[PDB]
Paper text:
We present here the results of a detailed functional characterization and 3D structure analysis of these three [name] enzymes, designated as TmelEST 1, 2 and 3, which are shown to be non-lypolitic HSL carboxylesterases closely resembling archaeal and endosymbiotic soil bacteria esterases.
Although the structures of the four monomers are largely superimposable (see below), the details of the [name] structure, which was solved at 2.14 Å resolution, are specifically referred to the detergent-free, monomer A molecule. The four [name] monomers in the asymmetric unit are arranged as two dimers (A-C and B-D) related by a two-fold axis, one of which (A-C pair) has been used as reference for dimer organization analysis. The substrate-binding pocket is composed of two differently sized, tunnel-shaped cavities (overall volume ~1930Å3), extending from Ser190 to the outer surface of the protein. The detergent-containing monomer exhibits a closer conformation of the substrate entry site, with the loop regions interposed between residues 48–50 and 56–60 shifted by ~1.7 Å toward the Triton-X100 molecule.
Numbering used by the authors:
A (entry chain A): 34 to 66, 72 to 99, 107 to 347
B (entry chain C): 34 to 66, 72 to 98, 107 to 347
Write the structure that this text describes.
Amino acid sequence: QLDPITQAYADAISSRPSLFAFPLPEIRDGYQSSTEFTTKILSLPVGPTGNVTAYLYKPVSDLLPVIAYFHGGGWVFGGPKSYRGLITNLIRESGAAVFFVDYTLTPKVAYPVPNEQCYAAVQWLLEHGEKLGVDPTNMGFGGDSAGGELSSSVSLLSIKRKTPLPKFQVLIYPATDLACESATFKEFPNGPGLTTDEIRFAASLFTPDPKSRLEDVASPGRASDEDLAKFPETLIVVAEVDPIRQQGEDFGRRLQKLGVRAAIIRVLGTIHGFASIDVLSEAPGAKATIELIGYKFKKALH
Amino acid sequence: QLDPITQAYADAISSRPSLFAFPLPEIRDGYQSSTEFTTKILSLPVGPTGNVTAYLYKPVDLLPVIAYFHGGGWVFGGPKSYRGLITNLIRESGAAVFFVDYTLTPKVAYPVPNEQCYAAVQWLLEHGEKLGVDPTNMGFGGDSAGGELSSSVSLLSIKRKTPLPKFQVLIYPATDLACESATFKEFPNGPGLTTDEIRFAASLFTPDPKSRLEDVASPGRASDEDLAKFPETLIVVAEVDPIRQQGEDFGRRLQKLGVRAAIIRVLGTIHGFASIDVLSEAPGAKATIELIGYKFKKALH
Ligand SMILES: COCCOCCOCCOc1ccc(C(C)(C)CC(C)(C)C)cc1
């Protein structure tokens, strides 16, 4: 069922204790190990905590299109280092700038603070982007896993507050419903790459109050028909062997029914994380869909 | 379950009788109704009938070239009905397309279309350079019945030790003409392609069920040793499609045998989405059509 490269990776980490457990490391972001880009480090004096860290990445040589990217890692891990591979791929394929939001990780904060940090950073980009050489009117959203929850959350908050939506949104195996368990939870309870236990752990740090999980801002899969019908055109990519697979597909079908242009693609033989884990990302299906994502940002953002 | 555009297409034709029935339409290929590429009509003195017609399309040193084998149940299709997909492929891939206009059933039957396609490829390999294309940078593409033909030509290349393409794309392919698979039961008349249409096509192409067991007819049933030598392959499949299982199983089989094989399922769409003009503009269809072209572009150099 799994392709050899993905199977080899799964075998190599079956031996590893899960990192989603106490005590948490104090380093939450690190490198996993040809396209060049510039980096501007931004401390934005905005949002619930008074600061949001953002990195603006631009390809080398009028206004560049820009992808606001919200990284995954279960709201506990990740940052510019661990996502360097995906950011590079996005920049190589899309030709766009990447606005990478380095929001505060759990449990230093909890829902809805990372959501509002991401939302506030986007509002800043909208106002000041032109001065950094990007075109805020040509904006994409991207997010993977927990970042997919954040991407769709920020979209929903934009709809609620009547602030600009991106032209195009990509959700990669997104978490869309933190409250309910879906069919694939049962099908792949610890099926490699992501286990039901890791999911519960991440959800307990990000939304310690289970009642929070029912809110549409936490779980955009539970948003109203009226709000979701206003979503930007969206591409959803899911891994086949993945407890969280059902959430993305159901969310996409829901967008389709409501008249949003939404494409949904299932990649066979791969697992959660294939877009950001270097080893997984070189397998045929993963590699193909990663360049599709970048290619589709290139086509949508002009 | 289907996206609005695809659902509307399915509804608009739900009252129409299947075209896979007698009497057959007298036109077997027509426009669904070029300035982006040139067209050269080639009469190749090859194959069991002594002729194979091929169209060489070139976009605006040597061009990469995609040998394309069209679908239509072996009974229908040709350059006219595939004008939209070919146009898309050329735009997105930037490659030339060698479109094999093989003889349709039942004027001929298996294995003549297979052998026509194989022989047209051998001609391209020998003469491509003088046509301004690079035979060492070749792709295979095929949809549905054409996916049977594409994987059949690959299998024949291996058996006969002739050059393989660098990259192969199978779009909702038929890979096994002998067996009914799980999705036959799940979508027996699920729109776009029905189980009756499947058995109808097979009755003209392979009237003798024993032919269907042959690996050349059904590459999904080829030996491990042959399949392990397949070129790098991307398989794209529609979700609501009786034949969905065949493409997915074939890909899993290539993956296990150590061939680099990607398999992608497009949700909310049906058989034929890559060549039917209306279906091809829906989000999922459109994305995967550009994916296909885009990956030919990246693979062919
Ligand atoms: C009159 O002009 C019509 C020609 O265009 C129709 C064909 O193009 C769309 C593809 O439709 C099909 C439908 C069925 C099939 C077959 C029957 C080959 C599927 C199979 C082998 C799984 C039975 C192939 C293509």
